[PDB]
Amino acid sequence: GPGMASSPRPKMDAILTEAIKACFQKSGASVVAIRKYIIHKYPSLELERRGYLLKQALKRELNRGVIKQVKGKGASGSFVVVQKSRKT
Length: 88
What we know:
- This protein starts with 11 loop residues before the first helix and ends in a 23-residue tail after the last helix.
- The chain contains 4 helices and no strands.
- Helix content is about 50%, strand content about 0%.
- The PDB classes it as gene regulation.
């Protein structure tokens, strides 16, 4: 585009979003799940292992409401609670 020196948008956010949404139900999503994922799935685990990016994201949900809330409770897609408890 019009302007050299540029960096793409982050993706790790969705990579883990898939884990909580897709995994939490199929395999379950916990602090270890995200950690072991960075460790086993990626090399970045060195820095990430400090549960900085992943734990903050995974735990931010848990710390917010036990990661049992994907969407809002009204204006959003109705009362939603992950795949394990994806209400209607």
